[PDB]
UniProtKB/Swiss-Prot annotation, chain A:
Name of the protein: DNA-directed RNA polymerase subunit beta
Parent sequence residues shown: 797 to 845 of 1342
Protein role: DNA-dependent RNA polymerase (RNAP) catalyzes the transcription of DNA into RNA using the four ribonucleoside triphosphates as substrates.
Post-translational modifications reported in the UniProt record: Acetylated on several lysine residues in the presence of glucose.
This protein's encoding gene: rpoB
Biotech exploitation of the protein: Co-administration of salinamide and rifampicin or salinamide and myxopyronin suppresses the emergence of resistance to both antibiotics.
Subunit and partners: The RNAP catalytic core consists of 2 alpha, 1 beta, 1 beta' and 1 omega subunit. When a sigma factor is associated with the core the holoenzyme is formed, which can initiate transcription. The rRNA transcription and antitermination complex (rrnTAC) consists of RNAP, NusA, NusB, NusE (rpsJ), NusG, SubB, ribosomal protein S4, DNA and precursor rRNA; S4 is more flexible than other subunits. In pull-down experiments interacts with CedA. (Microbial infection) Interacts (via flap domain) with Escherichia phage lambda antitermination protein Q; this interaction renders bacterial RNAP resistant to transcription pausing and allows it to read through termination signals.
Length: 49, 96
């Protein structure tokens, strides 16, 4: 995880029950960015032809 | 639904008019298709006033003509094979 500066504040209804506001700083600072690995495979399957 | 030459004409119509030798290719496909089939470069060049290496450019263009386009649409092709005898022969002379 990362240690984020957080505040306890209603903000125009952007945090109604469980909704969270994030900074443009954090995304600009490339925090929390996630990297994934997808895979592909292929065969030949020799046929009678 | 005709000869690939007609399909080639349709592709050329779809293709941009800026392609070199498009008119020459059209003229050859019109009524000089037999000359192209027999690869009679001498007679074809004499009749059509074909320039040197211009036939090469036309052949290269005809290479990108998507012959048998319906074959590519039928991408699906299940494999068919039967096991029958085995010749694995691991370490030589294996009783596969």
């Amino acid at each position: 995880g990362q240690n984020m500066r957080v505040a306890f504040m209603p903000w125009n209804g952007y945090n109604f029950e469980d909704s969270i506001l994030v900074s443009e700083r954090v995304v600009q600072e490339d925090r929390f960015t996630t990297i994934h690995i997808q895979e592909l495979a292929c065969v030949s399957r020799d046929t009678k032809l | 639904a005709k000869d690939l030459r007609d399909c080639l004409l349709i592709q050329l119509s779809q293709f941009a008019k800026e392609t070199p030798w498009l008119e020459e290719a059209r003229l050859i496909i019109s009524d000089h298709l037999d000359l192209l089939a027999n690869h009679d470069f001498r007679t074809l060049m004499r009749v059509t006033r074909l320039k040197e290496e211009v036939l090469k450019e036309a052949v290269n263009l005809i290479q990108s003509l998507d012959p048998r386009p319906g074959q590519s649409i039928q991408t699906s092709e299940p494999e068919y094979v039967i096991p029958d005898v085995l010749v694995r022969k691991v370490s030589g002379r294996w009783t596969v």
